[PDB]
């Protein structure tokens, strides 16, 4: 517990500790059982064997601490591939609700960096598991093996860069759709303006309740117009190509 707390969560530091203990054991290797100095005889082999057993047991149990977050990385593998299947089957150039599609496009650009991070994590994981088989690990049946996940992850990356890029270049249609949407929004804003100066109930002869209802209708449609304008602006800035 003390050494684990001192190390904390660090896979590379863990591998450094593993190579340190491995080289310490390698240096410890010896055949003599008694170190003779003058007429003095000292037992050396019994404690040697006991502490070699100590080294072996501690090294073995330290290895067991690693099977956990590897399970975490396989869970990451699954959450990537299973969700990505539906995500790649989801979007298309049509379905003018593309404000959601461009949201997913921004999501996948944001996840490019996470994909790179997970790739270097997979590199560290493959080094660690290589250590694991050269440390004679009995592979559990429910353990998901390295080559399966690496192959399916490479396939995931290939499909992602094959399809998500393609749908990204053909955006000029989406660009002109956003253009016509925003010019319609501007026209509606000008119309709402003209309606505002025409509708000014600032005169007090009007009944407060009826003019209040009229202003409530105007404010409902004006909130709708503001929602349209803000959603067009957010779609434009998320797509960020126009």
């Amino acid at each position: 517990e003390n050494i684990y707390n001192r190390l904390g969560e660090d896979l590379n530091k863990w591998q450094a500790l593993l190579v340190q203990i491995r080289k310490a054991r390698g240096t410890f290797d010896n055949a003599e059982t008694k170190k003779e100095f003058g007429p003095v005889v000292i037992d050396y082999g019994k404690v040697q064997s006991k502490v070699n057993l100590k080294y072996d047991s501690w090294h073995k149990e330290v290895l067991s601490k690693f099977g956990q977050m590897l399970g975490s990385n396989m869970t990451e593998f699954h959450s990537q591939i299973s969700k990505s299947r539906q995500e790649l089957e989801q979007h298309s150039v049509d379905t003018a609700s593309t404000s959601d599609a461009v949201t997913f496009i921004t999501y996948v650009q944001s996840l490019k960096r996470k994909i790179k991070q997970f790739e270097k994590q997979v590199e560290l994981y493959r080094n660690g598991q290589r250590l694991l088989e050269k440390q004679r690990f009995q592979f559990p049946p429910s353990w998901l093996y390295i080559d399966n996940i690496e192959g399916e992850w490479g396939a995931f990356n290939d499909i992602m860069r094959r399809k998500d890029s393609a749908i990204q270049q053909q955006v000029a249609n989406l660009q002109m759709k956003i253009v016509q949407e925003d010019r319609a929004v501007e026209s509606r804003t000008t119309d709402l303006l003209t309606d505002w100066e025409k509708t000014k109930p600032v005169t007090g002869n009007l009944r407060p309740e009826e003019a209040l209802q009229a202003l409530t209708i105007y404010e409902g449609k004006f909130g709708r117009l503001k929602d349209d304008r803000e959603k067009c602006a957010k779609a434009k800035e998320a797509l960020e190509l126009t």
Binding site: N2, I3, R6, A16, L17, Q20, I21, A24
Partner: peptide, 14 residues
């Protein structure tokens, strides 16, 4: 390197 050595340097008492 070390680490395994440096952790061993904080023996509790004497």
């Amino acid at each position: 390197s070390s680490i395994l050595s440096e952790v061993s340097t904080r023996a509790r008492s004497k």
